[PDB]
Design a protein around this ligand. Structure first.
Ligand SMILES: CC(C)C(=O)C(=O)O
Ligand SMILES: CC(C)C(=O)C(=O)O
Ligand SMILES: CC(C)C(=O)C(=O)O
Ligand SMILES: [Fe+2]
Ligand SMILES: [Fe+2]
Ligand SMILES: [Fe+2]
Lengths: 264, 264, 264
């Protein structure tokens, strides 16, 4: 088996091309680069520069105004390296220019994430309980980190995670070995998460990955709604060590009352 | 903005003084020293000496008699450095003298914690679902540690946490930088926790803190009851990344079936 | 008190012998070696050799065929050192010979685990809610690790955990000090877990242990069903820091929707 991380054009997938290859990739690797999805180094520059400007030239007062009262990294500024997070609502923006630039950037990320997830579902003949569109109108989280192992091995609990980033620190398990994941100015890196594995009945792999040890990274988590419902027996069938009584359960029943993005 | 950790007299607060300054502190810093609350180095000496005596001169048999069958550090003796924990009931005391001394010490800590939390609620015009007194008649946990980073950065999930302690190891984020928190023989240190943030609708900050690397520390967590109820949309509004279906939820729905005191 | 890790013959226990000594051990130590339970170095050789052969001579393709889409270590092969896991159903076997050998090995482990747990319940006069047999027909997990501190201090959340293994790395807290736990070709090592503490009302200790830093170890967790029910007030009485509203709760209510095997 070739341990090369493949690349797929979103447009070609939506045209019904490379279906066998796509299904194979999802099952055996669970990761791939995605082109023709409206996201490149171009649509990233604007957002990157303005947030970097904020991280470097923003005053403690300005940063305070966009910092949540609890340091959860859900919205606004966070000092972990620095981070800026946002979602579909309840956002914290430092300026009008910043808001316009980041709202557009977030929208493009959310659109691309839903589109590729839509293809993952179609290629596996998966109809989520409640329908595809209700499943995809969810609870995304975008996190931009600035770093002027650096992250332990783990897998994502998202449906899919889109990464842009800017030495190759990011590595993922492929074929049984850690493969480097360099940036592609013309594409976005896609990691399938445990929810893709769960909703498709085990047809999709959620690969482990980590960051080895100055750069920036944009991570977009497409996460299901709390009421997303699934089959308990089926979950057991593909590796989930669930402690759920009954035949069906929700994302909330499984993970709890607070979103958990990664797992070791 | 001045990054000085302020001090407030509990008596003066209860008199309606320094309200604007108190509200400001709660919002921008989330920590402060508290005087005139019935807790000083005097009321600590008795408890400290007797527990230290136990840690140093107690036999393995005597320690066994006050050690829980599961090493949870909820009640009795624990060997992590050593620790002694207690609550409102189901306690484990090694001697009659010990029980009298620590029951009085616990009562003073619980009274002071409820009193300052009462002021936090009043200064923010907060009426918890179910009322103030039902909210404050809760599930406190007192932990005394003896140490004859030493603790990773985190925030507390309590309403408020009171610390006495005895080189300055304790540090908290203030103004965007770690500020030392030395002991005050005449005051107790108060950290606001995530529940203060939650119940007040985001009017209170839960500051991150840690312990840098021989001394003793008394930590009192004022924790809500499992059935404490709050608004889900409001929680989302102040930074909580909740995965809760519906409009209202309980502490148990959010955190789960076991108390969690801190979060990184 | 003697800090020696005792040994009990399962057959002698089932005959009503050494009851006081057994109860004492369960209360003060929570661990012991078990002989005459159908498990020795003999019944381990076959399984060990064949899995070692797989770990060393198995191709990436063969390992892939028995690897779950999510890296949970619940079933099949896992590359953490390597590991092979199995349960009562939904298993992944690389060959017919492997399946026959490991199914028999698993059955012997499950039978021995239920038998000793049955004795733990009898010696403490414990009748689980719903009855003994329903409690023991549960959700076991067997994990075989190959290692051609190595594990932080923790306690198990199982009813009981059986260990075989093959310098003494394994250590447990006994009498207030870490005692080495060498292998016994004629016996299996038994650690009592938090569920034994819980179901017996605090009559059984769940000892902390860890692995100091090439060998193999077989760990069998006898875990309760999600619907196992217990008394909340009683749980509080023996050290469990539960945040459960009401008088009764289930394992799922306490731990959540995913099994958790250990706790620090
Ligand atoms: C650091 C990025 C690449 C990541 O894996 C994550 O945030 O889950
Ligand atoms: C160590 C003390 C100061 C603490 O932060 C805690 O226990 O939460
Ligand atoms: C490593 C083994 C002995 C263990 O303690 C466990 O897996 O819980
Ligand atoms: Fe990740
Ligand atoms: Fe703390
Ligand atoms: Fe263990």
């Amino acid at each position: 088996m070739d341990t090369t991380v493949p690349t797929f054009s979103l447009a070609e997938l939506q045209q019904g091309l490379h279906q066998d290859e796509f299904r194979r990739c999802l099952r055996d690797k669970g990761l791939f680069y995605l082109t023709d999805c409206g996201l490149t180094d171009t649509e990233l520059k604007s957002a990157k520069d303005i947030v970097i400007d904020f991280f470097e030239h923003g005053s403690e007062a300005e940063k305070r105004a966009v910092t949540s009262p609890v340091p959860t990294m859900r919205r606004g500024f966070t000092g972990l390296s620095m981070c800026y997070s946002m979602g579909t609502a309840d956002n914290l923006f430092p300026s009008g220019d910043f808001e316009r630039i980041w709202t557009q950037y977030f929208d493009r990320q959310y659109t691309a994430s839903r589109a590729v997830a839509r293809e993952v579902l179609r290629a596996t003949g998966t109809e989520p309980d409640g329908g595809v569109e209700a499943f995809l109108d969810c609870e995304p989280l975008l996190r931009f980190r600035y770093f002027p192992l650096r992250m332990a091995p783990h897998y994502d609990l998202s449906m899919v995670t889109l990464i842009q980033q800017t030495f190759v620190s990011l590595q993922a398990e492929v074929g049984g070995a850690f493969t480097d994941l360099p940036y592609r100015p013309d594409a976005v890196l896609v990691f399938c998460g445990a929810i893709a594995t769960l909703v498709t009945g085990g047809q999709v792999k959620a690969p482990r990955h980590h960051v080895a040890a100055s750069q920036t990274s944009s991570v977009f988590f497409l996460r299901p709604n709390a009421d997303f419902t699934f089959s308990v027996p089926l979950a057991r069938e593909c590796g989930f060590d669930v402690s759920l009584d009954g035949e069906t359960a929700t994302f909330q029943d499984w993970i709890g009352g607070n979103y958990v993005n990664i797992r070791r």
